[PDB]
Design a protein around this ligand. Structure first.
Ligand SMILES: Nc1ncnc2c1ncn2[C@@H]1O[C@H](COP(=O)(O)OP(=O)(O)O)[C@@H](O)[C@H]1O
Ligand SMILES: Nc1ncnc2c1ncn2[C@@H]1O[C@H](COP(=O)(O)OP(=O)(O)O)[C@@H](O)[C@H]1O
Ligand SMILES: C[C@@H]1O[C@@H]1P(=O)(O)OP(=O)(O)O
Ligand SMILES: C[C@@H]1O[C@@H]1P(=O)(O)OP(=O)(O)O
Ligand SMILES: [Mg+2]
Ligand SMILES: [Mg+2]
Lengths: 249, 249
């Protein structure tokens, strides 16, 4: 509860990188991943993981009453595919079932397993994804990958950077990207989604939630072969070609 | 830490049923499950789960430095196969990754996630298996399915019955099955394995560990189509045809 120095000149202490399903699969082609995209992304994620050893999670999107239980199995497969690929290039990537670690209480995700923190402290790379989570009444709910960074908020010390890679450069207004969103008052960003129609709304809600708890959050375009080293760097030092929507408080 | 009434006349409060890989797969045929065996076993397990609603786990055997991480993925698949089958017949079966819930400390498994207890309290059937677990130094270890019942010991109240279904009727001495093993002094059972050669040794170690902490443990032959209703009943009420090795204190 100490004073945390923050700003565009500061280096993040922790990276939560989420890779959208759009970027490595097609809905028209169920349970089929684009292996080339996974391969190329994995190379870039591997470099980040070495710098942020024990200070990063990779969150995968994608993945095919109690019937929702199949979701846990579907998203486990996606985590396996990333982790296998990453281990193949020397990263200590370990998939973790969020449903075994987290439950919902009054709608808020609750981390209920100490294992995630231990895995990080051991210097491994947790590979996470969305899931089917139980609430306090025993009902299952689909918990989007986009919301996984929320589960990190009480656990991460220091400066959390959350980056959601998607198939657009940010929040589009009209015609142009919105470069900055103030999480204390983001009504303009929500108004832009209404202009352009719920995937991005879930992203915004999640990243506003994280930004209100100090995180530096980005919506930006992913590309399998793109160098991501700049995500280790202070925002003010980013290359000029990089486009994003930045959500902060 | 109260007085728990125990004995062959008493009904178990909780069932941990482990199904050996031998019973629904072949090592000569990697990652291939016998679907007919899984189907038939699932029918029998479903009946037990209805009686022991919230009071049972199913533990699957089988399943194909940091390379051990692939084990978590291999045993997740096996848990998925059981859970899918069980949900298909109306059981609320939910696979849980033990590696996300449990770590090793001084060689002892430690339950580190509250989720298992919640899932049980919600009346669902956890489907478990062996796994790759981290220790306190960040090293992965293969943790046998046969040892999963140990993780339940601090969590289960009342009378725990552990049943390990395998491809033999019990511990064979010489020629005959050993019907009773006293966990306080089981040197004779260990001597029998030396006669007949480490799968059964792991079983014995695990079940002795559980029996020393009050559990009523059995090694017995599994058969996909065999009725298992007797496993809800006091030992003294079991049908006369049933053969097993019973491990108690
Ligand atoms: N104002 C907006 N700006 C950008 N994208 C938007 C907007 N409103 C809705 N979207 C949609 O959100 C999509 C990104 O979310 P989604 O399909 O869930 O991606 P992912 O697979 O990367 O999670 C974009 O492709 C876009 O169609
Ligand atoms: N004294 C013994 N009695 C019975 N089985 C024994 C004994 N010693 C070794 N075993 C072996 O243990 C095997 C059961 O263990 P295992 O192959 O690991 O089965 P599962 O797949 O059911 O875990 C038997 O098939 C048997 O070969
Ligand atoms: C809970 C479920 O996994 C889905 P998602 O909403 O996480 O995935 P997206 O990046 O659009 O595939
Ligand atoms: C940890 C790993 O799963 C293996 P097992 O030793 O649990 O399985 P068995 O019943 O002989 O297949
Ligand atoms: Mg989405
Ligand atoms: Mg075995």
């Amino acid at each position: 509860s100490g004073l945390v120095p923050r700003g565009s000149h500061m280096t993040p202490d922790f990276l939560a990188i989420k890779v959208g399903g759009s970027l490595f699969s097609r809905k028209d082609e169920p349970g089929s991943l684009d292996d080339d995209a996974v391969t190329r992304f994995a190379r870039n994620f591997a470099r980040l993981a070495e710098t942020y050893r024990g200070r990063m999670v990779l969150i995968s999107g994608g993945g095919a009453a109690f019937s929702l239980a199949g979701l846990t199995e579907a998203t486990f497969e996606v985590k396996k595919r990333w982790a296998e690929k990453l281990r193949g290039i020397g990263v200590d990537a370990f998939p973790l079932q969020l449903a075994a670690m987290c439950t919902l209480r009054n709608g808020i995700p609750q981390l209920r397993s100490e294992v995630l923190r231990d895995v990080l402290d051991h210097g491994a790379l947790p590979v996470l994804a969305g899931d089917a989570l139980f609430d306090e009444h025993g009902k299952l709910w689909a918990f989007s990958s986009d919301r996984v960074p929320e589960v990190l908020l009480p656990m991460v010390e220091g400066r959390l950077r959350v980056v959601t890679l998607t198939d657009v450069d940010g929040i589009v207004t009209d015609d142009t990207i919105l470069p900055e969103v103030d999480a204390r008052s983001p009504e303009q960003a929500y108004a832009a989604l209404w202009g352009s129609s719920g995937a991005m709304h879930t992203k915004l809600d999640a990243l506003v939630t994280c930004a209100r708890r100090g995180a530096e959050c980005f919506i930006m375009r992913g590309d399998p072969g793109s160098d991501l080293e700049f995500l280790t760097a202070p925002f003010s030092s980013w290359p000029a070609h990089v486009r994003s929507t930045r959500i902060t408080t």
